[PDB]
Design a protein around this ligand. Sequence first.
Ligand SMILES: *[C@@H]1[C@@H](N)[C@H](CS(=O)(=O)O)[C@@H](O)[C@H](O)[C@H]1O
Ligand SMILES: *[C@@H]1[C@@H](N)[C@H](CS(=O)(=O)O)[C@@H](O)[C@H](O)[C@H]1O
Ligand SMILES: [K+]
Ligand SMILES: [K+]
Lengths: 672, 671
Amino acid sequence: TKGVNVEILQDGFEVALNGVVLLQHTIQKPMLFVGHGEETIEMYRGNFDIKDYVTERTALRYANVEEMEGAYKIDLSNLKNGDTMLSLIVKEEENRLKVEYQKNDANINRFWLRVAADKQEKVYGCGEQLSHFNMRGKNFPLWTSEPGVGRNKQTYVTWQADVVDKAGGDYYNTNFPQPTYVSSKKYYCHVETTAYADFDFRNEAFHELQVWEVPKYMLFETADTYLELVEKITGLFGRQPELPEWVYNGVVLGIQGGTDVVEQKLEKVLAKGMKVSGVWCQDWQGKRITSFGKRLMWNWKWNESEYPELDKKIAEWKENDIRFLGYINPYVAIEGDLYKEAEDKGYLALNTEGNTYLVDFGEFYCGVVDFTNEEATEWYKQVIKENMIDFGLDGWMADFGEYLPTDVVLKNRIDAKIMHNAWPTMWAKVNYEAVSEAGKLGEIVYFMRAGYTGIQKYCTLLWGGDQSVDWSLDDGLASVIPAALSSGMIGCGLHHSDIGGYTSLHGNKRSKELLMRWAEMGAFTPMMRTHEGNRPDDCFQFDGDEETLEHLARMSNVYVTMAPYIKSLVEENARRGIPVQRPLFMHYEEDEKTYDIQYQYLFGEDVLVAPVHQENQTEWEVYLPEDQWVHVWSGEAYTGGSVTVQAPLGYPPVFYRKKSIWSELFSKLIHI
Amino acid sequence: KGVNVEILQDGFEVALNGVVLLQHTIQKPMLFVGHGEETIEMYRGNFDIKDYVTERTALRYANVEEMEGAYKIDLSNLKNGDTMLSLIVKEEENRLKVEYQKNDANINRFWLRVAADKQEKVYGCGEQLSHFNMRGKNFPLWTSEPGVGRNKQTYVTWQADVVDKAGGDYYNTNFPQPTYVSSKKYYCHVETTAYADFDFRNEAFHELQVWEVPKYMLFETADTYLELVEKITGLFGRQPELPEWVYNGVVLGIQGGTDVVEQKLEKVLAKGMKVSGVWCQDWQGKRITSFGKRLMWNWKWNESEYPELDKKIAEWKENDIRFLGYINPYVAIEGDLYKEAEDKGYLALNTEGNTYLVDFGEFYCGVVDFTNEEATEWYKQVIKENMIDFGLDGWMADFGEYLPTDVVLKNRIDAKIMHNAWPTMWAKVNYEAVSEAGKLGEIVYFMRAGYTGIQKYCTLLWGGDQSVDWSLDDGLASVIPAALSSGMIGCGLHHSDIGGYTSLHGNKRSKELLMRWAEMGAFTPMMRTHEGNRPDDCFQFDGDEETLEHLARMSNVYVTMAPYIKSLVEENARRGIPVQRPLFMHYEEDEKTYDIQYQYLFGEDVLVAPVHQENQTEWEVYLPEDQWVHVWSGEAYTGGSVTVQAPLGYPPVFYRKKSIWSELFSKLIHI
Ligand SMILES: *[C@@H]1[C@@H](N)[C@H](CS(=O)(=O)O)[C@@H](O)[C@H](O)[C@H]1O
Ligand SMILES: *[C@@H]1[C@@H](N)[C@H](CS(=O)(=O)O)[C@@H](O)[C@H](O)[C@H]1O
Ligand SMILES: [K+]
Ligand SMILES: [K+]
């Protein structure tokens, strides 16, 4: 009943952990398949066209099981007797089910495991998912990439993104895939691989996990509660630090265009009472105009012409309690000194001809710093220590990580088809080690959009990457909510988004209303930060008018008022890996409706948030689970059920539990 | 000569007349078998088809045995394993024939690799509307609505998908066929009616996927493309000669009743237009939907909408004007034919045992079950009684592509196999009604759907519904590869709606497009117009004097050329050499001609390069090495790329000086 039971039946066998039956094999219903495929992968500016051609897929119907020193060895073939094509070790290790896999045949480069399932089972995770929190009913390729603009082939924006740039994407695309899912049966499954995989949840009777290698091993672990499960899952993958205290001082203002403009906007905003934690100037190292809009010069050193006197102003701003954040990514532009330095030292990834591999990022080309080369890794970390940390940055956006082409040649001589998905975590580790080795862990925060297994430790803060500046479900304001939920279930519990979104293309322009609604949601997350977007002049900004400025100021005061509670949530995330933004089922397991909600979240245990994610709304339907709730703005009391509440601009549908030990604090929001 | 099977060290090679076709080694196996679980969703003739392949087994090991003059080949996954596929390879007629037998009932997926070269081109697979040379892509073969737009990059396609799930893609067609022709001068035919997918993406082999183990395949070589198409029509069959009356000029598409027919006829005759007949698709009744002006699907003269038609038909015949109607293989629920069929049990059923009702778009119809011989004879009698005896000289025989995969048929064969068979069965109904009435060569019907065997049963193809636009994938141009592809697999009579059909998603037919389309139509077996789905949104042939005069002129071009066109139609009947021919069919040595699909040879002696783009005054044309004469100017040209003026009324058309018809073609200078 406890631990790993392998029951041998006449048909075949069953593997169970703590009585939860996970793996079921019979001759008639086999659980494992192996085969061969020849894939075509075309990259274009971070977008991947991936087609497989499967030449063989073989059902391993016949199993021989041997009981051994606590462990089981199972040999599998296509025919009764038959040569062994796959060999399993099934064991309990550190209280988990562990299944190790060993193949004989070098031709085998395709693997499929079926895990038993029910009609009603729901599945969550697979990294940051932007369209579907509950993944049941679809299949999810797991390949880090540009997530897509629009992400739904039915919309005009997606269509145009495909037509013009091959960039529309689809429901499964993400910067942060992960071969790890959580089941409503209260276990998680992890496949240890960095190869392409595709988790297929279309079949009622089983989930099928495809991998483009035979994975070294899988881990399963069960739990009694979702709270316990996520604690165990962060036990495996790791836990994020507490955010620096200064984050709680208010909004990180996204401002570009030089020192003078930053100073003037900081003063204008402070005067209107906005609470500011810091200013984030992504163009500190230099701007770069393309047809896409205002981008950046990818050379990670202060640009004295564009940002005069930044060295002095940073310290000046610090003495007024205003921190400074910059920008870096793992690539270096050909025009810059860092590219030149790297090339001379041999720190860049190579092509088959033995020269620098140059990647198209969109009207400019850059080298890839080869993080498989430990010397190059140390070099890039010194670049961070010297040009960012010592220069007095309190943080930065650590962008990208998803653009490794499958035809690069790396120092470690491992195939790029296997290194591609590993890159985000390697990129994270670089940031983590630079910060840690400088003794700034807990004081400097960087934020990343890309990920893979293990950023649970190495990434100090996620953001949702580039959303469209619109109200679409698949790439607008709403898409952030499943993004936070999904990422929390697999152990990344600190999440935020660009206030206003980023991507202005194909006729999408950011409206005033959208910016305000986005600030409303942002105040009920770990960090409020704004972004000018790709085309600042085409998007409404926070200083676009007095009403907007005052709206953001008000929401900044909401966040700061809640700071003590949010801190407690961030400390719980650090201690037990319980995410800041939680799915409703995590606290209402017995409520069937909560397993399919993805546009509401619990902000800690005691607050329910249901952001207005549609245009031109004055009221909003909310589902409340059975508890005693208080609408934060009105003080009106509600028990469980669907309710409509008024939600004018500035008054997001947010509720707190009357039983909260924080009720005194939440009551202060009536008067703001 | 004939079939040599060489046994090599690691496998075998099968050759026919020295063309090596099949190559099997343990390392490079040619046959794979497996299991799949498919999902097929139908919506108004559009099919979403996804496969889930659970097994695919490489049959690496072959044991070859002699016999009669046949060779028996047993194939397995392991050396001396259980035999999973068994072949008989033999010469029959003068063809390579490969018969296949499986043991295991679980096997429902089959893949044959046939050896290929880097530079090989492949043609056919039925009527292909986007790609004549299919090399470099894969082609599902499942009869369906062909798509509106047919290219995901265009606005029209995008909207067709968003609103109606109807955009389709490059491979969609009403007339797929599991038959291709290789530039190595052989054709390959897979005898199946199951879903198939011919994959030409690999340099070293073509892969033919079938969702069953096919009974057999046939290969045949030839020395020339002319001989190849003769042999291929030798297998599948040959079309009759068209009726003499077709060559009297344009078949006018007119709707809206007897009086409107008379008024249009008078206006057009007075402007000197040569008219062969009138085609009134609403003779049995109209039906308005949100789609536009459609039809009431009950195949009997509608006395209210077409008063006195019985008398006018004979009157028009005395003025040398024939009459054409419309039928399809479905019956509308509101009509008497539906009621009759239901009572007699002639309709296809659902799993609950009742009439299967198919959504055709805002209306529902029953499917006449041609697997029921009694129902077949019944529908043929309906044609004899209501159409032939009523005095129709022809008709559009529409549709054939909408058999749902969950229908239940009298013969109790799975609809996944009967779906692709339906077009040919539908054709056979038309053929037998006409043949049994002794009217073959006097009555002509035209169809858009097809499968293996309409080479005999379909008297005339048309390209179906094109968009009323200039797009390559669904506009005027799309017709040309459609005719070429169809000719290579033995359907040598092809035409299109003059003006196209589909007005949707902002597409409206312009004057210019109608004129350019008439220009191409004059250099095809039949000139016929169509009002389109929304007649008031499309420019018509009587839209203005310039247009009427343009069509009159083009009608005179066609009639002047009638003797030549007749000869072409006679050659198609005798030897199966198609009326519209790829340039490589007469210039085998010219490498550029194997990739041209927007030009054709109209018989041996005329090259046509239709202007298929808007607002053009001139057009670049590729001419192979010969002595050519621009039809309109008399200017002479030898081989190469050349630009010629092509104002409206003056399509880029050339004839060979050497032609025994040069006297006739000279008359076009003055017309
Ligand atoms: C990454 C990147 N798209 C932007 C920088 S740029 O230099 O590539 O333009 C950032 O502004 C985005 O926020 C981030 O997603
Ligand atoms: C078939 C069909 N689409 C039309 C008739 S209707 O009643 O379905 O509208 C014909 O007008 C079309 O030419 C033919 O493709
Ligand atoms: K995006
Ligand atoms: K079409």
